[PDB]
Design an enzyme around this catalytic site. Structure first.
Site, mmCIF file in Angstrom:
data_model
loop_
_atom_site.group_PDB
_atom_site.id
_atom_site.type_symbol
_atom_site.label_atom_id
_atom_site.label_comp_id
_atom_site.label_asym_id
_atom_site.label_seq_id
_atom_site.Cartn_x
_atom_site.Cartn_y
_atom_site.Cartn_z
ATOM 1 N N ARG A 44 -80.166 -10.488 -10.412
ATOM 2 C CA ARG A 44 -79.019 -10.110 -9.574
ATOM 3 C C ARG A 44 -79.324 -8.876 -8.734
ATOM 4 N NH1 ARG A 44 -73.477 -7.766 -10.924
ATOM 5 N NH2 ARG A 44 -72.410 -7.883 -8.878
ATOM 6 N N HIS A 48 -78.826 -8.604 -4.793
ATOM 7 C CA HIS A 48 -77.827 -7.663 -4.327
ATOM 8 C C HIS A 48 -78.444 -6.675 -3.361
ATOM 9 C CE1 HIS A 48 -74.214 -5.069 -4.874
ATOM 10 N NE2 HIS A 48 -75.082 -4.077 -4.777
ATOM 11 N N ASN A 76 -66.767 -6.188 -10.423
ATOM 12 C CA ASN A 76 -67.738 -7.135 -9.881
ATOM 13 C C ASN A 76 -68.706 -6.551 -8.846
ATOM 14 O OD1 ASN A 76 -66.092 -7.151 -7.593
ATOM 15 N ND2 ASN A 76 -65.523 -9.300 -7.764
ATOM 16 N N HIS A 178 -76.907 -18.377 -10.795
ATOM 17 C CA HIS A 178 -75.788 -18.314 -11.722
ATOM 18 C C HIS A 178 -75.981 -19.250 -12.940
ATOM 19 C CE1 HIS A 178 -73.012 -16.645 -8.364
ATOM 20 N NE2 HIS A 178 -73.947 -15.801 -8.755
HETATM 21 C C1 HEM Z 1 -74.256 -15.629 -1.936
HETATM 22 C C2 HEM Z 1 -73.227 -15.853 -2.733
HETATM 23 C C3 HEM Z 1 -73.059 -15.179 -4.025
HETATM 24 C C4 HEM Z 1 -71.854 -14.774 -4.555
HETATM 25 C C5 HEM Z 1 -70.475 -14.885 -3.941
HETATM 26 C C6 HEM Z 1 -72.143 -14.189 -5.842
HETATM 27 C C7 HEM Z 1 -71.191 -13.570 -6.642
HETATM 28 C C8 HEM Z 1 -71.436 -12.991 -7.881
HETATM 29 C C9 HEM Z 1 -70.447 -12.424 -8.732
HETATM 30 C C10 HEM Z 1 -68.968 -12.278 -8.454
HETATM 31 C C11 HEM Z 1 -71.049 -12.104 -9.902
HETATM 32 C C12 HEM Z 1 -70.331 -11.559 -11.144
HETATM 33 C C13 HEM Z 1 -70.069 -10.059 -11.056
HETATM 34 C C14 HEM Z 1 -69.094 -9.648 -12.121
HETATM 35 O O1 HEM Z 1 -67.953 -10.201 -12.173
HETATM 36 O O2 HEM Z 1 -69.397 -8.714 -12.878
HETATM 37 C C15 HEM Z 1 -72.428 -12.433 -9.768
HETATM 38 C C16 HEM Z 1 -73.344 -12.284 -10.778
HETATM 39 C C17 HEM Z 1 -74.663 -12.716 -10.686
HETATM 40 N N1 HEM Z 1 -75.242 -13.279 -9.593
HETATM 41 FE FE1 HEM Z 1 -74.359 -13.823 -7.927
HETATM 42 N N2 HEM Z 1 -73.446 -14.335 -6.125
HETATM 43 C C18 HEM Z 1 -74.092 -14.835 -5.062
HETATM 44 C C19 HEM Z 1 -75.457 -15.119 -4.926
HETATM 45 C C20 HEM Z 1 -76.440 -14.853 -5.892
HETATM 46 C C21 HEM Z 1 -77.829 -15.036 -5.722
HETATM 47 C C22 HEM Z 1 -78.464 -15.462 -4.415
HETATM 48 C C23 HEM Z 1 -78.428 -14.700 -6.938
HETATM 49 C C24 HEM Z 1 -79.853 -14.723 -7.270
HETATM 50 C C25 HEM Z 1 -80.683 -15.623 -6.803
HETATM 51 C C26 HEM Z 1 -77.392 -14.305 -7.824
HETATM 52 C C27 HEM Z 1 -77.565 -13.940 -9.153
HETATM 53 C C28 HEM Z 1 -76.527 -13.460 -9.946
HETATM 54 C C29 HEM Z 1 -76.748 -13.155 -11.386
HETATM 55 C C30 HEM Z 1 -78.001 -13.465 -12.158
HETATM 56 C C31 HEM Z 1 -75.598 -12.648 -11.845
HETATM 57 C C32 HEM Z 1 -75.298 -12.153 -13.242
HETATM 58 C C33 HEM Z 1 -75.582 -10.642 -13.346
HETATM 59 C C34 HEM Z 1 -75.512 -10.067 -14.744
HETATM 60 O O3 HEM Z 1 -75.226 -10.805 -15.734
HETATM 61 O O4 HEM Z 1 -75.872 -8.869 -14.875
HETATM 62 N N3 HEM Z 1 -76.207 -14.456 -7.180
HETATM 63 N N4 HEM Z 1 -72.618 -13.149 -8.592
HETATM 64 O O1 LIG Z 2 -70.293 -3.672 -20.066
HETATM 65 C C1 LIG Z 2 -70.514 -2.776 -19.217
HETATM 66 O O2 LIG Z 2 -69.647 -1.932 -18.889
HETATM 67 C C2 LIG Z 2 -71.887 -2.694 -18.575
HETATM 68 C C3 LIG Z 2 -71.938 -3.572 -17.352
HETATM 69 C C4 LIG Z 2 -71.577 -3.227 -16.055
HETATM 70 N N1 LIG Z 2 -71.742 -4.297 -15.221
HETATM 71 C C5 LIG Z 2 -72.293 -5.349 -15.866
HETATM 72 C C6 LIG Z 2 -72.628 -6.653 -15.483
HETATM 73 C C7 LIG Z 2 -73.151 -7.533 -16.430
HETATM 74 C C8 LIG Z 2 -73.280 -7.141 -17.781
HETATM 75 C C9 LIG Z 2 -72.910 -5.866 -18.212
HETATM 76 C C10 LIG Z 2 -72.431 -4.960 -17.272
#
Ligand code: HEM
Ligand SMILES: O=C(O)Cc1c[nH]c2ccccc12
Ligand SMILES: *[C@@H]1O[C@H](CO)[C@@H](O[C@@H]2O[C@H](CO)[C@@H](O[C@@H]3O[C@H](CO)[C@@H](O)[C@H](O[C@H]4O[C@H](CO)[C@@H](O)[C@H](O)[C@@H]4O)[C@@H]3O[C@@H]3OC[C@@H](O)[C@H](O)[C@H]3O)[C@H](O)[C@H]2NC(C)=O)[C@H](O[C@@H]2O[C@@H](C)[C@@H](O)[C@@H](O)[C@@H]2O)[C@H]1NC(C)=O
Ligand SMILES: *[C@@H]1O[C@H](CO)[C@@H](O[C@@H]2O[C@H](CO)[C@@H](O)[C@H](O)[C@H]2NC(C)=O)[C@H](O[C@@H]2O[C@@H](C)[C@@H](O)[C@@H](O)[C@@H]2O)[C@H]1NC(C)=O
Ligand SMILES: [Ca+2]
Ligand code: NA
Length: 307
Positions: A44, A48, A76, A178
């Protein structure tokens, strides 16, 4: 591969630190074994960063909006803290192993994302290198203009992507990121309350309401209800069951421009993996600094202060 951006090359550090890629992979393999969610965090973080000004490590800076100092963001836009720490720990290890400051933070981001994909069961791919680190802080406006929200539908997603030269194929494949990781209730609560969004599988909606029983629940759930931590095509199997978490996920299946690719990838993990590898390498070359532009940071959280 996609075309390489001018200034980038495969194995850029062959002479200056030939062990660099191996050092990053070893670190990520060990670190993820201790903290499985770190892989999602690192993937991510690369996405990002790339969408916020360009793949230039701007979001690592203490002082950047959504950076490691950030205390005034919504859930988010508050990134996993362990992923910032891992990039710095990797970069510290490289300082020791390379015999000085050689490898950019931007290149560490791209490498660590690939190693995260691989350790999670995903495809291996070659990563172009030679990126350099921005000395500009990201602002709130940079973040808000660069990143679509999870409430966005396909036309809005495609508009954002077109400005950075990504197309609908890239959208569908890259959204497969995702297949791992977590989402906060607040990123999808509007689909539950006041009434359930009709595009959400009713059985899944019932399960999510235990997960997030009201608006403003401070909790996170897997993005991929089928295989939370495995990098696989189950993300797309979710979509075809109307079990994508975000609007921006499930609209991929709804919208005529993207539906066929969702079906293709739900049916063939090999097809997904091939396209993901292509598209994620394309993504990681967006607006890169090369040559003498930017810096090789000595500390990924700060601009170099002494030339
Ligand atoms: C372009 C449209 C995209 C949207 C609207 C989007 C939106 C988001 C949102 C809302 C989250 C969750 C954040 C939260 O609620 O804490 C997220 C997490 C994530 N996104 Fe995306 N995303 C996009 C594209 C991507 C791309 C291109 C990748 C990688 C190739 C990616 C990888 C991830 C990963 C792995 C997470 C989980 C992060 C974590 O667990 O720490 N996303 N995304
Ligand atoms: O749990 C927390 O407060 C740490 C945290 C911040 N943003 C996050 C996104 C994915 C997983 C854990 C976290
Ligand atoms: C709303 O979400 C629900 C889950 O929360 C969906 O219910 C599930 O639907 C799936 C099918 O999409 C069911 O799984 C199938 O079960 C049958 C009977 O046991 C299997 O024969 C079938 O396996 C075959 O097809 C697969 C492709 O679909 C192939 O991959 C596989 O090799 C076989 O050829 C399949 O079984 C799954 O197979 C893959 C395995 O990894 C997995 O473990 C295995 O379960 C599932 O049983 C079902 N679950 C529940 C709780 O009902 C729901 O789907 C709709 O409603 C259900 C009741 C069925 O009628 C579905 O056919 C239908 O799509 C979904 N609503 C949507 C899609 O509108
Ligand atoms: C790398 O740069 C970081 C950003 O400038 C430094 O972090 C920070 O240090 C400041 C204290 O000098 C402090 O006010 C900031 O809050 C803080 N920012 C963050 C996000 O932590 C970091 O310096 C170190 O780590 C911090 C926590 C302190 O213990 C410092 O004394 C450390 O030097 C820099 N790291 C290094 C190794 O220089
Ligand atoms: Ca998965
Ligand atoms: Na950036």
């Amino acid at each position: 591969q996609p075309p390489l951006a001018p200034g980038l090359s495969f194995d850029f550090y062959k002479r200056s630190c030939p062990k660099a890629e191996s050092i990053v992979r070893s670190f990520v393999q060990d670190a993820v074994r201790r903290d499985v969610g770190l892989a999602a965090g690192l993937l991510r973080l690369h996405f990002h960063d790339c969408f916020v000004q360009g793949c230039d490590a701007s979001v690592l800076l203490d002082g950047s909006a959504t950076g490691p100092g950030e205390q005034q963001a919504p859930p988010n836009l508050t990134l996993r803290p362990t992923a910032f720490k891992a990039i710095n720990d990797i970069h510290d290890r490289l300082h020791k192993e390379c015999g000085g400051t050689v490898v950019s933070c931007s290149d560490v981001l791209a490498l660590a994302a690939r190693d995260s994909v691989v350790v999670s069961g995903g495809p291996s791919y070659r990563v172009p290198l030679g990126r350099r680190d921005s000395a500009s802080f990201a602002t709130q406006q940079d973040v808000l203009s660069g990143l679509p929200p999870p409430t966005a539908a396909v036309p809005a997603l495609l508009a954002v992507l077109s400005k950075i030269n990504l197309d609908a194929t890239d959208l569908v494949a890259l959204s497969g990121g995702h297949t791992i990781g977590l989402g906060h209730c607040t990123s999808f609560e509007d689909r539950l309350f006041p009434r359930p969004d009709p595009t959400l599988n009713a059985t899944f909606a019932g399960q999510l309401r235990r997960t997030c029983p009201a608006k403003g629940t401070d909790r996170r759930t897997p993005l991929d209800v089928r295989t939370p931590n495995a990098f696989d095509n189950k993300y797309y199997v979710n979509l075809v069951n109307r079990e994508g978490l975000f609007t921006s996920d499930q609209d991929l299946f709804s919208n005529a421009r993207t539906r066929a690719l969702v079906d293709k990838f739900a049916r063939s993990q090999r097809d997904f993996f091939d396209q993901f590898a292509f598209s994620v390498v394309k993504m990681g070359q967006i607006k890169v600094l090369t040559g003498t532009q930017g810096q090789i940071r000595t500390n990924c959280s700060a601009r170099n202060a002494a030339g």
